[PDB]
Amino acid sequence: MARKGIILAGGSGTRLYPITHAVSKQLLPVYDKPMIYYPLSTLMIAGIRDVLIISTPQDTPRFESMLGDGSQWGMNIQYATQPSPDGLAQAFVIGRDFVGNEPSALILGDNIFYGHDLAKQLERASAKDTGATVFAYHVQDPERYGVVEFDREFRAISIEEKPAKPRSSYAVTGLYFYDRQVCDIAADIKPSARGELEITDVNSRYLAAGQLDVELMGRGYAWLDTGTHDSLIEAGTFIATLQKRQGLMVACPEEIAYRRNWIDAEQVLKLAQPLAKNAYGQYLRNLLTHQVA
Amino acid sequence: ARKGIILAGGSGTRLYPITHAVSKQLLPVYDKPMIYYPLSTLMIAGIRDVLIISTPQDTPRFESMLGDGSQWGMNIQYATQPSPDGLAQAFVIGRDFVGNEPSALILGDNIFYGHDLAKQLERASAKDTGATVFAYHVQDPERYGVVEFDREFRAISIEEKPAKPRSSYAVTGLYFYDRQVCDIAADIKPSARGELEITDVNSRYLAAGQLDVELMGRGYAWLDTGTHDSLIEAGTFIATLQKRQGLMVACPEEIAYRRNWIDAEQVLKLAQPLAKNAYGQYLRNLLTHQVAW
Amino acid sequence: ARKGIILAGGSGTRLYPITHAVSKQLLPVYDKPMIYYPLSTLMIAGIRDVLIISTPQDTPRFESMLGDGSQWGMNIQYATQPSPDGLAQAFVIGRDFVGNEPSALILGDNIFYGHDLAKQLERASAKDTGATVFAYHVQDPERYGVVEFDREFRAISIEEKPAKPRSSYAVTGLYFYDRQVCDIAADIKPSARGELEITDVNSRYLAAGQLDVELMGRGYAWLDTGTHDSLIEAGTFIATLQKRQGLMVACPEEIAYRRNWIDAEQVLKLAQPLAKNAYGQYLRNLLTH
Amino acid sequence: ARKGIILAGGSGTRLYPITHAVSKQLLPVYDKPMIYYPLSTLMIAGIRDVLIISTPQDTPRFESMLGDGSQWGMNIQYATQPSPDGLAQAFVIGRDFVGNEPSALILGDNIFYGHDLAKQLERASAKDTGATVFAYHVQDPERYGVVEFDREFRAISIEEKPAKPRSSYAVTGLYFYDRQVCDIAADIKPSARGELEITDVNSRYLAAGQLDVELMGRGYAWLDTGTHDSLIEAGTFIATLQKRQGLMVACPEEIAYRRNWIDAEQVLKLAQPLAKNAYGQYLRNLLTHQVAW
Numbered sequence A: 001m002a003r004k005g006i007i008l009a010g011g012s013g014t015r016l017y018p019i020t021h022a023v024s025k026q027l028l029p030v031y032d033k034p035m036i037y038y039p040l041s042t043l044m045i046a047g048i049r050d051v052l053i054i055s056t057p058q059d060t061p062r063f064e065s066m067l068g069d070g071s072q073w074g075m076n077i078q079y080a081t082q083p084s085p086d087g088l089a090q091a092f093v094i095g096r097d098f099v100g101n102e103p104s105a106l107i108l109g110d111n112i113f114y115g116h117d118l119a120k121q122l123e124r125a126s127a128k129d130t131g132a133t134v135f136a137y138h139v140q141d142p143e144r145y146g147v148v149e150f151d152r153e154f155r156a157i158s159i160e161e162k163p164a165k166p167r168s169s170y171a172v173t174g175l176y177f178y179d180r181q182v183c184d185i186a187a188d189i190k191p192s193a194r195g196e197l198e199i200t201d202v203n204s205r206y207l208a209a210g211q212l213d214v215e216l217m218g219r220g221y222a223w224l225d226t227g228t229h230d231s232l233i234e235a236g237t238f239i240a241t242l243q244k245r246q247g248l249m250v251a252c253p254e255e256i257a258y259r260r261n262w263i264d265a266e267q268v269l270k271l272a273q274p275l276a277k278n279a280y281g282q283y284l285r286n287l288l289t290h291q292v293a
Numbered sequence B, D: 001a002r003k004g005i006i007l008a009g010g011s012g013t014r015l016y017p018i019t020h021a022v023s024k025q026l027l028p029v030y031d032k033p034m035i036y037y038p039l040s041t042l043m044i045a046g047i048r049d050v051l052i053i054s055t056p057q058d059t060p061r062f063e064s065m066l067g068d069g070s071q072w073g074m075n076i077q078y079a080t081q082p083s084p085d086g087l088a089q090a091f092v093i094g095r096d097f098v099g100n101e102p103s104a105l106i107l108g109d110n111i112f113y114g115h116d117l118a119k120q121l122e123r124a125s126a127k128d129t130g131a132t133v134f135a136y137h138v139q140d141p142e143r144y145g146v147v148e149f150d151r152e153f154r155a156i157s158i159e160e161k162p163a164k165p166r167s168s169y170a171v172t173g174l175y176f177y178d179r180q181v182c183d184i185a186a187d188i189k190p191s192a193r194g195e196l197e198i199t200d201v202n203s204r205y206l207a208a209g210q211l212d213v214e215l216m217g218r219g220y221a222w223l224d225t226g227t228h229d230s231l232i233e234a235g236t237f238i239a240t241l242q243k244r245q246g247l248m249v250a251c252p253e254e255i256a257y258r259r260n261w262i263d264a265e266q267v268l269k270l271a272q273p274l275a276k277n278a279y280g281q282y283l284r285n286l287l288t289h290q291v292a293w
Numbered sequence C: 001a002r003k004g005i006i007l008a009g010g011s012g013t014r015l016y017p018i019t020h021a022v023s024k025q026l027l028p029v030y031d032k033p034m035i036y037y038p039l040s041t042l043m044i045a046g047i048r049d050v051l052i053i054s055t056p057q058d059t060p061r062f063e064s065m066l067g068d069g070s071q072w073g074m075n076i077q078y079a080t081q082p083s084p085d086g087l088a089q090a091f092v093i094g095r096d097f098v099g100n101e102p103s104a105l106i107l108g109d110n111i112f113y114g115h116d117l118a119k120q121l122e123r124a125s126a127k128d129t130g131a132t133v134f135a136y137h138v139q140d141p142e143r144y145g146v147v148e149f150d151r152e153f154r155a156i157s158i159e160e161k162p163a164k165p166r167s168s169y170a171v172t173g174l175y176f177y178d179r180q181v182c183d184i185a186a187d188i189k190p191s192a193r194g195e196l197e198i199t200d201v202n203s204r205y206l207a208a209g210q211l212d213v214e215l216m217g218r219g220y221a222w223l224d225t226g227t228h229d230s231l232i233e234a235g236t237f238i239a240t241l242q243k244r245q246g247l248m249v250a251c252p253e254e255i256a257y258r259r260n261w262i263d264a265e266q267v268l269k270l271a272q273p274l275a276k277n278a279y280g281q282y283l284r285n286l287l288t289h
Ligand SMILES: Cc1cn([C@H]2C[C@H](O)[C@@H](COP(=O)(O)OP(=O)(O)O[C@H]3O[C@@H](C)[C@H](O)[C@@H](O)[C@H]3O)O2)c(=O)[nH]c1=O
Pocket: A008, A009, A010, A011, A012, A013, A025, A082, A084, A085, A086, A087, A088, A090, A108, A109, A110, A144, A145, A146, A147, A161, A162, A171, A172, A173, A174, A175, A196, A199, A200
C-alpha cells in the first residue's frame, strides 16, 4: 500500500504580519531549518514517499525551489495550488487526482510533531486499511480548534469546530490519516458558515460511522503550531535545546531517507559536497560513520 | 517496594555565585524548584520511599521544601553528604535506608522528560537481579560515563570521562539496582580523581554479565544543569511545553493524586493555603479537569 | 554621603513554589543572584553604605551572600521586616541607619540597565533638596504607582494601582530622597490596602513642588520579575548582552575596582578562592583587560 | 540630505538551509523582518533616501517587502550586487545614488539598540568633513575590524580580522562618510581576500586625521546574526523589551510618524488593512498614545 501524503501549506492570513508579508509562513525558520521540513519529516517517518505540497499560486515556486521533486531524498514530491484558504478539506478536492484510489494523510505545513515512539504511532495509523485516524492533544486554548468530547473512558463522543464552550481541552491535531473514502466525503460536505470546507465535518462523519480512531497523543509529545510571534520563537528555542544537547538534528530529511534506505551513502555524500564547510553538510557526512539505535 | 535516593549534594563553585548561599537543587527550573523534577521521576517509577541526601547545611532547606512526604502519600527521609566525594557514596550514606531492598538512585539536578517514560521506568523497576542504566546520545559524551557498543545491541564497556569516548551514549543520572549495590559500593575504592564512582559500581555488574543498558531515544529530553546556559535553557524548555499544553511538568501533587496516593480531599487541603496563585488553581483544576493518564 | 536601602523582604506567594524555601532576591537571574543587580545600581550611583532589609529568616542568607561589604570597600548592614507592610516602612525600619543623611531606596528584585544610567543616577544623587523618582513606559501600568502628566508633560499627580491608568508611565523601584523622608514616612498612615505607601511619600514631595519625575526612556530596561515568565526573560536578556560583549552586568567587584574602592591586590584575593570558575577568571581579567 | 545604503546582499551558506528559502535579511527577528531594524536605524539618524543593495535574485523580494518607501514618507531605491566582493563595493554600486552628497552605510543584518542612540547618530550625521565609525566591546573581536587604542585611548589603526587582536573593540556595521568616500572606494584595491575592504576605506580617513571613532558603551546592544543561535537570541532579546514596555522596537511607521514624514491620516490608511492583527492595533494606538517628552 502506497499511502499518499499531502502537506497543506497555503495562505495563513495576516496574524503574523509583517514577517509573513513577503515570505510564506512555512518557509520561515524554526531554529535552523525552514518550518516545512518538520511536517515533511513527520510524513517521511510515517513511511510516506509520495507527497503533494499545496500552497498559494504565488508561493508554489518558492516551495518548489526549496524541495524540488524529492528525488534527492528518494521521494516523489509534487505541487498544486490553493487560490484562497477555503478549508482544510479542500485539500481532497485539489489533491483528488494525486490521491487516486489510495489511502492518504493530510498534515498542516506549520505543525511540528515531536516525541518518543512517534514513528510507531504513525506507522500503526498508516498501516490500517479501513477507517481514519486523528490525534487528540491537551492544549491551553482548545477553543481555537476542533475539540474532542470524551466520555469517562476517553472514548470520543463528538468533534466540534471552535466551540464557544469546549467540552474538553483535547484538540484535534493537524495530522490526519484516511482510507479511500475521504475524497468522496469531501465532495459530499458543504462549506460552513465561515465559508470553509471543514475537516471536522469529514472527521465527525467517520466518527458517526464507528470508523474513527481518536488516538490520545500524551503530554510527553510536543505538538506545536506557530500561531503567534511568541509561540513561533518558542518552538525554535525548543528545537535548539534538544539539538544542542543531543548532537542530533530534528527533522533532517536526508537523515530519515538514508536510515530508511531511500538513498545510499554515495547520494548522502553528493548532497553533502556543496555544504562541506557548514554545519548541515558536516551533519550529513557524519551520518556515514555514526551509530544510533 | 523499591527505595529511591535523590543525590542532591554539593555542586562546587562551578555555578558561582548563584550557588554560593543556596544549593543548586533548590534553584528554579522555570516555575518550580529543580528537585521537583527528579522527585517526580521517582514517583512516576512508582517509588514512594525516598531518601534526600544533601550537604548538612542544606538539609533543613530541603526539609522545609519537601517535609516527610506524607502530604503526597510518600515517605521522604534525609541524610547528609558533607563533601561531594562520589555518586557511589549514595549507597554508603544510604545503606541503612536501602536495607535489604531494591533501590534506585537519581541525581537531584537531572531532568527526564518524554512520552512513555513510565513504561520504561516500570520495566527497569521490575527486574529482580542485576542493574539497569540508561544510555542517551549527547553532543559531548566525554563529560560523562560513556557506553561502548559492539556492532549489535550489547554494551561491552562503561568508561568514566574517557579521552576517546567509544560512543556518543552517555550514562544518565538514573540507576536501578538489585540488593547487591550496597555491598559493591562498600567494596570499591575511590578513583584517581578521588571519588567513589558509580561507573565502578556499574562495571562490577557489567563484568558479572548483570548490567542492562536501556536506550533512551532522541524523543526524550535528558537535561542537566551544569552551566548557567544549560540551567536557563532547561527553564525555557519546560516553559514552552507548559504554555502550550496548559499542563504542568513534575507537579508532585498531580502525580500522587492520579496514582491514588492522595485523594481529592487532600488535594483541596493542599490547595487551600495557595488559593490565590496559579499553583493552587492548578491543584484545584485536578479535581474538575479531564486529563488522560 | 548618601545612604542606600535595598528592600528585599517578603514577596508573597505569587511565585510559589520557587520562593517557598528560598527568598526571591536570592534566586538566579542568569549567572548571579537577583540582588546583585539592584546592589550594583546603588554602587553605580556612588552609594557605599547600604542597609539590606529582609524577613527575619532570610537575613543570614543575605549576610552569607554579601557579608559586611568590606570585601568591596563598602559597608553593608542588615535589618529585618517582620511583615511586608509597605515600601515606606523601609524608612521607619532604616531610620537610625539613615540618620540625617540623604538616602535612596531600591527594590531588591528590580533590574535597571542602559546607556548613561550612571550619569542619570549621579544627577539624582546630587540634588540638595527634594526627591527624584523615575517614570518608565510599561505594558501594565495599573500594577504600579502611575504618573499623571499635564499637557506639557510635567508630572502633576501619582496614584497607586489606578483602576483606569492616566498614562502608561510607572514609577520605577528606585527613589532618591533628601533628609525629610524619614519624618515623612513616620507621618503617613496605612492605606486602604493596609500598607505604608511609597506613593504617599512621593505625592507629598510632588505636592510641595519638590519632586523631580525623570523619564526613563525606552532605551533602558527596567525589569522586575513578577511572573515566572518575566523572571526567565530577564535572565535570557542579561545572558544575550554578556555573551555578546564579554562583559558582565552587575559585577560588584568590577564596579568597586573601577571606582578605586578596592585595589588590584584586593581583586586578586577575591579571585583566588574562585580561581576554578568563570567568575574568578573575570575578576582576574579586570587587571589585564 | 544624507543618503543611506543598506547592504543586504549575499550572506553565503553558513545558515543553510534557512537561507536557501528566504534571503537572510527577510528572516524574522521576533515580530518583524530583520531588515526593519537597520532600516529604522537610518530613519532615527534622519535619513529618508535609502538604497537597498542585494543579490539580483533577492532584489525583487526586498521590493515587495518595502516598496518605494513612500508609505513612510521615504524614498527607497534598489541596486544589485552579483557577488559579495566587499563592503566598500556599496560605494561603487551606489555611486550614482550617493551623487555628491554625504552618505551612511549600514549592514542589513545589524541590530543597534539603546538609550540616546538618536543623539549619537545625529552628531555623526552632522559632521561636515570626514567620517565617523563606532567601536564596541565584543567577546570575539577577531571576526571584525578591530580598533587599536593608545594609552590615552585614542584610535591608532584598524586591522581587519587580525590573528592577534589589539583590543576587544570591533568596528560596528554602521558608517558615516562625507563626499570623499565614493572616490576613495574606487581608489582602493582588493585585499588578500578578493574583497574591497571597508577597513581600508576607514584607514584612509584615519591616516588623513578625518576619522572619528566613537565608543559605543556596554549599555547599547549591537547584535548581528551570523549563526542560528545569535539569530534566535536577537529575537528573544527584542521580545523581552517589547513585552515589558508595550512599545515596539523598529516600527518604521512609528518613527516616520513621530518625525512628521507621514501624518495621522496616513497612519490610519496603513492600519486599516491590518485592523485585525497586533501590528495594526499598534499603529492605531500611535494616534492616541502618550509617549512623548
Ligand atoms: C483553512 C486553511 C488553512 N491553511 C493553512 C493556514 C495555516 O498554516 C494552517 C491552519 O490554518 P487555520 O486557519 O488555523 O485552520 P483551521 O481554522 O481550520 O484550524 C484547524 O486546525 C486543526 C489543527 C484542527 O484539527 C481543525 O479541526 C481546525 O481547527 O493551514 C491553508 O493552507 N488552507 C486552508 O484552506
